[model samples]
Target: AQNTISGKEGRLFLDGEEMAHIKTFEANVEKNKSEVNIMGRRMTGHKTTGANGTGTATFYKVTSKFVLLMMDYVKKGSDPYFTLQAVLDDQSSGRGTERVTLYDVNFDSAKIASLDEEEVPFTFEDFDVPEKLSDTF
Candidate 1:
């Protein structure tokens, strides 16, 4: 049966900007929202072995306009979902009050002139995830 949502149990945001309204049925997933951090300079986009070194993972970055700051995430694309936004706060964040800057962004084409810098990066703000995946995560 098709689901018609009525009430949301919680809300999520990237850098404090509202991005998702998780319904009562899907609130459990929202509760697991992991708090992760990324170092801008440490991300190298390289894969490594898991023996003496930690397993390989990827981090993508983009500049956030709302707060004029940069953010990082493990997942790539432009949905702003699964992004690791930044703020001065160390505790859990909520609503539009959390300090954030990075938006949904990806490594687009090179600079039109420089050919060195990646195009403007954004996160969920710049793109959308497929409808089929909505609310579940």
Candidate 2:
């Protein structure tokens, strides 16, 4: 039927997954820039003045070893997203690799993603993953 696991079944690959956490950030060209705290911790926009749109937003990596794979499952960006940082020279994709972006990464939010049972529901019985070797068998 449909894909994507939802509710309790659609679990995020957490637990033993890599994780990290970020703290502070330097303000860019934000209104009342002088009034804003330098080393202060903040979340969400609190623009009472509503001077402008797209307030100073900071993407952080509050977890360890996150990835944003581009195409070939080779991660293009890594680490805390807030830091605006990542790893290059993607040797992680292995050889014969035409292209590789992010292989895998943990979710940025605590909430779980909804998925249908049909999302790659194929089991060992459907294919020769276990008892058998390759599909040719």
Per-model TM values vs. the true structure: 0.18, 0.17
Position 27, candidate 2: lDDT: 17
Q: Which candidate is the best by lDDT?
A: 1
Candidate 1 least-lDDT 10 residues: 49-58
- Global lDDT for candidate 2? 0.21
- Model 2 residue runs over 4 Å out of place are 1-19, 32-65, 68-137
Per residue, candidate 2 scores C-alpha lDDT tens digits across 1-137 of 12111111011122344333211211122234555531122112333332221111123332223332211123333222211111212233332122111112222222111110212111110000012112342
The whole-model lDDT of each prediction reads: 0.23, 0.21
Instruction: Name the TM-score of candidate 1.
Output: 0.18
Give the TM-score comparing model 2 with the true structure, all chains together. Answer: 0.17
- How far residue 135's Cα lies from its native spot in candidate 2, in Å, is 61
